Amino acid sequence: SFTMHGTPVVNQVKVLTESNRISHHKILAIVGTAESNSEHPLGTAITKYCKQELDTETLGTCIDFQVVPGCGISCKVTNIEGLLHKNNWNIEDNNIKNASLVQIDASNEQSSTSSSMIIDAQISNALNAQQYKVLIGNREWMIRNGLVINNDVNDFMTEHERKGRTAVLVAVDDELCGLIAIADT
Secondary structure, three states, X not given: OOOOOOXXXXXXXXXXXXXXXXXXXXXHHHHHHOOOOOOOHHHHHHHHHHHHHHOOOOOOOOEOOEEEOOOEEEEEEOOOHHHOOXXXXXXXXXXXXXXXXXXOXXXXXXXXXXXXXXXXXXXXXXXXXXXXXXXXXXXXXXHHHOOOOOHHHHHHHHHHHHOOOEEEEXXXXXXXXXXXXEEOO
């Protein structure tokens, strides 16, 4: 029923900045953990590639995820260094639903209420990590953001899109940082 088309793979990822603003490993993390969201089968494929290259389950960052089709993604990311044994008490399930009413005239099988939220919990811990603004999109949206591309990589990306496969750059707070080549197959 649900499957009809072939499934893509992440093929090559390459760095495009030195450790001056952000280092290669910290870039690999924020690129991967930004797809811990609920977007597409490629997000599961990115997170699965990245977490296996990290060789640790110790990831998962809050993201202000914004999306434009045919152009790219923009997000605000936090909790990067915060993978640690926390300053808090690890209370992430505790909630007080405080329900009311039960009837014969309503015949069971209702939605069931919810109350409480995960408030104040991160505010003791969040001082352990930097907050970053991160953007992922094609060469044509990067130059429109106010960034500039280099001709050596622009040829490789041109040739990859001519080969009918999907190609994007990564940037952080108005600096270049990497590229991603994904095989449509």
